[PDB]
Amino acid sequence: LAMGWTNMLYYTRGFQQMGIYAVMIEKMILRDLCRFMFVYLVFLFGFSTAVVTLIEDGKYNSLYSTCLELFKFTIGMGDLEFTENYDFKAVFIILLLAYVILTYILLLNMLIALMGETVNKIAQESKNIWKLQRAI
Amino acid sequence: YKGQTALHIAIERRNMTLVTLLVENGADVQAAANGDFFKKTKGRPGFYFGELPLSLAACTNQLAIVKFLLQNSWQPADISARDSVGNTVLHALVEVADNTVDNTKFVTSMYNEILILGAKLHPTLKLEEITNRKGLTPLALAASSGKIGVLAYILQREIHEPECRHLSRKFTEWAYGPVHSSLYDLSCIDTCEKNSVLEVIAYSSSETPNRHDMLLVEPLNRLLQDKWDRFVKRIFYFNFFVYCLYMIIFTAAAYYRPVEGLPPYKLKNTVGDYFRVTGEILSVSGGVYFFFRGIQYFLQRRPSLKSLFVDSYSEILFFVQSLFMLVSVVLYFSQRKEYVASMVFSLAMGWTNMLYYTRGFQQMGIYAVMIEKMILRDLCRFMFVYLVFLFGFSTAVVTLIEDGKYNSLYSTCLELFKFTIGMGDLEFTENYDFKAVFIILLLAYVILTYILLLNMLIALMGETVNKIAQESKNIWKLQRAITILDTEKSFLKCMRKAFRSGKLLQVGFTPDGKDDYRWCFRVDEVNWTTW
Amino acid sequence: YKGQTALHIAIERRNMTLVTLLVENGADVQAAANGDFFKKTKGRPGFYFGELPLSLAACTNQLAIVKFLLQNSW
């Protein structure tokens, strides 16, 4: 059901503006989202493993839970205090702050800038791709 | 000034009559002006030219005067002369160039003319292997000094001159119509065992004006790509896989660390415990390996203690990971719990060091270079300003708060920081008086940091992206070149195998009856225009 | 290479005299150079032109030579 609903974009061809917009979306998902996802996933897995290792025992003593909790930061929902079951609170807070600075502050903003450049660069190519799609 | 002799002044004055009038009656022509005004240094800015009358005439672009050499009523003007630093005329020419347009143009033209005349007068002499006190050939000096224009000139030299064309460096083999194949000499570029253009450029200090743009010259780029595709691609992929496997084992070992207290911990006779301990051993061994590798790099390269913390971030990061691992082991055997903290620090650093291998894939390598530049410039500036703002307003707020949980600098600073990540509260406490002041302070802080500075950070990064495309690509190319050079010097699987290029007899005959082989390198080219 | 005939070389050399000297006395003009150097593929980069003397002259942009077609002693 979800795949079918999201496949409604296919028909956006046949309307020049929305067709070009859909082509923009393709190109973005192909290049920028891919690169950012690779780097960000490496970062997230690394820091998540470190954090779970630090945690002594409790609800968040599993890789899945800690990974989800670290990911919650990316969507503006981080906690910075989601657990206390550990020692050496300084290390925990240092790790969380480093992860925040590296991913949220830097990489997301970089994603916005790279997309902006991409938009600035692929106007004519997007229009031509839309024309080819309509021809097909 | 110490050698402003009559002929010196005449040449500096650029007159064709006084020079000749001195030439007659045998004016001395081997005087060296070692005056402090004639040396190289910023103090009392003078004009270094080579210290010899021939060199001076050359630096002044006096071709007309030149060709006075090897005449009568005259004294020797050996092209193989040497000053107090051993520089020849060619060395002076490379020194004077400043990578401008006209300067390049003239300097290359002269350099040529002197080459041809020297070949004519003494065909049995070999200029370009002459070396100075530093032992650097003029090509080597240019490579190590930042003069891109001359590098491009020499490396693409052509002299279609019937009797002494052998000095040329670029050759054309066959033209079966519109497509023809050319040869580029490799001698003293990839393998010299004393000084090679590639090794010099790669390991050149950070102060070189054009270290990045040097590799864009034709021959160098083709050679690096060729070596890559030949063997470095596979060697690098193998190294990447090994590092990934080591990281996986380290993570697995750390994850299952026992929780009993006061290490070291007794080894129960079990399969799982056995796997944990062997994984530990593997991880510690990898840490030792990286530590020794970093030590070897530090001793072999011998950084000048300034570029040490300014270049080679990757070496520093790997060495720091090794240090954390080793300290973790030391504590683990010292009966302390902090080995866990050291272990997690090392684990996170190692995982985030996986970006290093993103070189070897053009797109991701350029992306990593973008990330570097951003962290270096934009993140730094924003962090400084934002930290000043945050500390100021945090101190003000904590002062305002009367007493309670948030009556400490750390807690209030954390609470104010929570705003930056879209988690602010605006009501996290009420223990105070004068709520208007509190809300005013919080609103001012929000407006100044969240609304303004973050958005400004996005805009500045956008500008940076728009500005550093080509530089990022060039930096990635340099990184890959350094990787190729290390790998080749590593003897990991080479052992002088994995050869470099093909050999040919290109001249047919040198000026002497003997022939020669010049270790050439082929690159086919096709052109329609210019039949 | 398999068909580097005299006229082939002359055309590749782009001279108006050798071509005519071969044209007289009826030089053959339907030779196909199926040499591996004259085929299409990356290995041993050569120059594919069509494999025929007319095609070769065309790929070389020799209009002057062209229009030699449909003449005598030919």
Numbering used by the authors:
A (entry chain D): 545 to 603, 627 to 703
B (entry chain A): 199 to 603, 627 to 752
C (entry chain D): 199 to 272
Give the published text.
To visualize the lipid–channel complex, we added LPA to nanodisc-reconstituted TRPV1 and determined a consensus cryo-EM map to a resolution of 3.0 Å. Through symmetry expansion and focused classification, we captured LPA bound within the vanilloid pocket in multiple stoichiometries, ranging from apo to all four subunits occupied. We thus refer to these structures as ‘empty’ to differentiate from the ‘apo’ structures, in which an endogenous lipid occupies the pocket. With resting and fully liganded structures representing closed and open configurations of the pore (S6) helices, respectively, we examined intermediate conformational states associated with substochiometric LPA binding (the four subunits are denoted as A through D in a counterclockwise orientation as viewed from the extracellular face).
